[model samples]
Target chain A: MRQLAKDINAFLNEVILQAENQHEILIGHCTSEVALTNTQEHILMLLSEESLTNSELARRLNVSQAAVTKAIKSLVKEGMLETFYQLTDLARPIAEEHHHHHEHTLLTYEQVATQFTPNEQKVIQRFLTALVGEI
Target chain B: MRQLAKDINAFLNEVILQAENQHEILIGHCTSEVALTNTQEHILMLLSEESLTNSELARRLNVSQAAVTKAIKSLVKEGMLETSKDSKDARVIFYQLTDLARPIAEEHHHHHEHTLLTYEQVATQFTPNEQKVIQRFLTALVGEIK
Candidate 1:
């Protein structure tokens, strides 16, 4: 249990460091589309790669579904989100489709990279390149 | 310097992991008193033990003072804070006292712990105890690794 805790701690730490280092670049992309609360911004960034339900977001953020719902609703009202009914369940509406596709195009890595200083651009390219290499 | 970077990274990682594990518990404690942004909540948690100036907070959080000031102003206006003139220098008014003392008393850790399950309490005690043991471990680890 101790070792497990240690390992978990180590992994969490790396995630945070990366988040901190990359937050400006990531958040710059997010804010260009819509103004969001810090938590909301974090959720959007987390969802940028793959679609996730409200419950999934809640679990990842360690927040209540109600909190997630509140954020989602706010985002939707702001025209930063759009909701779609799930094909699988006629009665069950999918929360994952709440994000606005239009906003996604406003901010790309290349566009965001333009906002960075020369040093920052170099760092970002190196970081992204290393990240891609790792993958 | 490689070791130094590794140590820093390792230390930073522990800080983040601890923040994550303790977040819900800590944030719950915070929300009962005041509604704040996640970064604001984190800043408050960091300042709970000691008062820090805006520049100090900015340095610690790796953000600009502008961001810190914005949060401070919002918190102040929301009646969650109170600003005071610093005794040290008239030119620089302290930003630390922006937090409202009235709200601070309303939600103590003891009270927050009440909302937790019994198992959570056991876990909390054990975790906090273990944390104290290693509170300086990362710092020490940095020295060794460097």
Candidate 2:
């Protein structure tokens, strides 16, 4: 556990360090003009876990709903995020209907990773390994 | 790489969630106050890579010396961090995590990997080959960063 902790911590440091250095985020294409900030990434981190409405996110994040909305709006626009009906019951009659659109947008970690560079993928790979290495 | 990215990203999200919920940091019985804010963590993160002077930390972080001093001072006092002088050169100094910090860091690692009771999350999840692939990638990345 001791050694594993050092490895994971070191990996995250490099990740956050690399993340901090990046002032700009790329679009789906490797080269682009769209800008991505770490704050946005922070928000993405939250969304990756579970889908949340603007208010729910604001509460968890302790930020204004406006800030949450703005951050999410941009992310949705970037297509890194996707909104889907909360499928608690697939047996419901309206399962596939857009009527469920009121639910919040959700992003899988993979969805968010897609727009980034190849190097970004490897970092995640390393991070996961280091995390579970000792186990 | 893509699948690995997804896994790592999700795992970090969980770790950060746990980090945010933590209020007091422990010391070596253990010490992992490793989280003070992203800014402070950023400092510790850099220090973990290599010993660094106050100015070097300030320069890398782009914050003022005053800000750096204030942060480092608190960390040092808490025993989670320390400053070591260059024995050969009195004027040279470096900052590093203290022994007390190790347990806390160890806890961090344990939880992040489910390094504990939840062996299923890690041990049962990845095959030997997959683990090797991910481990190699991290090794190379660290080498590059350093």
Candidate 3:
């Protein structure tokens, strides 16, 4: 158990180091084109990849709903992310939680995820896989 | 590729979730006997697992050495973590947290995840402008690596 704990800790460190380093990569990419804070970039990255509510964004980013809201505010101001009621939106869970009021932001490109070149994006995808314990 | 992105997000979520949840456990534990801040406890937890020099602890924890020094300072004050100079490596400052302190590490969620979260905590040490410069340096690395 002790050794397993050590190994798991090591794996977690590698995954985190990879994410932080890649995140730095993306954050580094920010300039007049993206020009977003790291938090805002993460919001754009996650939204471009998955359609999620403010609540989901908060949980996934390990941040407060207020922090997520702040990031969304930046992206919405930049015009990269748009939010709507979407009476037909699938994220609202058509089967049961219908008419729910919370709105989600969608990535405007196909998607800005492409902003990350495929090669660099590969690191992003991989760390995200390890992050969620995909095995 | 799209699916890989989705899977990656899900994994990141789970990893972050587990990390976030364990702190809920540690938060309660922190206030009691040890009374350590979360980062301090984690530093002790890692040292307890194995004696690590200041540099190794920083790398393994994925935090700056200065940040580790600060946490270790608190632990050293509490006598929870002790510093020793190795005759083998004079410049290396070895740290060890003992069996007595072991009981205080009352949560289980993968210490590395805990350390990753600690990165955010460490960020608080810097001003927003400082953070921006760090971001720029990192971004520069991306350009170089590319």
Candidate 4:
């Protein structure tokens, strides 16, 4: 029993770390396919609604003018924005495309659970529930 | 039987998301407690290893000179640095982490230590059989998502 406890400890940590790493890598890679930072994406979404100047965006974003300009420059590089500071045709469908990517990118627990036998699934659930409560 | 699948999915997602969110919160909370931002803590940690000038830190940290200067000012205000003039030139100054900042750096490491300990404690509660099931499921999940 004592030896088993140590084994479980070692195995649990390894799996948990691997899961976290893999999940982060998957999410990061998928999100970067669109190649926009959170701020840049927000700028696209905002502009997708209506046009705004650098000063207006600076105030609305609660960030510095430099930050806004940097994101704008990147958007321009991606051809998502016109130099005139408006969303281009390429930028308009980004939100919907982003949504589609996100839905496919993440693997839901339901999908993973489907592969396990009911008995094994129950054990996994018990461990996860206990982990959630304790950790 | 179908309900069991739904329950397991809900529990799995709930626990996974909660763990990630909590980990982030722990980091944020730990940094805020010492009144230092994550960047400030990192600067202190790097300085604790060896005193470095602004240009050195800027190159090493991949930050702008102005950014380094800004963090240096904040550290000085917080009494976390002891600035010294370099012997080579009066224009170049070295910033060293002071005694006050040492504990903050140690605390930064301790936060991760504490997190691992919590996970270990929870894992030990399961029987080896149950643990094997979990380990297998997690390995499968990683591959499934990979």
Residues A1-135, candidate 1: write the lDDT tens digits. Answer: 233234323433444544453221121233232345655655555555457898997777666678778877876665555553012221112222223322342233234334445554444333323322221
Ranking by DockQ: 4, 2, 3, 1
- The regions of model 3 sitting more than 4 angstroms off are A1-12, A21-32, A42-62, A69-135, B1-5, B21-39, B45-51, B83-99, B102-146
Which 10 successive residues of model 3 chain B have the least lDDT summed?
B21-30
**Which portions of model 2 show Cα errors greater than 4 Å?**
A1-7, A19-55, A59-135, B1-8, B15-52, B59-64, B72-88, B92-130, B137-146
* Candidate 1 clashes between residue pairs 3 or more apart in a chain or in different chains: A13-B13, A82-A98, B81-B98, B81-B100, B82-B98
Interface RMSD of each: 15.1, 8.4, 12.8, 6.9
Q: C-alpha displacement of B91 in model 4, angstroms?
A: 19
Q: Chain B TM-score of all predictions, in order?
A: 0.42, 0.42, 0.46, 0.51
Ranking by TM-score: 4, 3, 2, 1
In model 4, the runs with Cα more than 4 Å from the true position are A1-96, A106-111, B1-33, B42-73, B83-96, B140-146
Instruction: Identify the candidate with maximal DockQ.
Output: 4
Question: Among all windows of ten consecutive residues in candidate 2 chain B, which has the lowest summed lDDT?
Answer: B21-30
TM-score of structure candidate 4: 0.49
Query: A71 in model 1: Cα distance from truth in Å?
Result: 20
Q: Report the C-alpha lDDT of model 2 over B19-132, residue by residue, as the tens digit.
A: 332221111122244456544655665666567777898877666799888888977887768767766444566666777666554555444444233333342355555445
* Residue-level lDDT for A46 in candidate 2: 56
Please provide, for model 4 over A1-135, each residue's C-alpha lDDT reduced to its tens digit, 9 standing for 90 to 100: 334334434444433443342122122233444667756766776787677998898767556678789989988998988854887877777755554444443445456676778887777777767656754
Clashing pairs in 3: A28-B139, A131-B11, A132-B11, A132-B12
Report the candidate with higher TM-score, 2 versus 4.
4
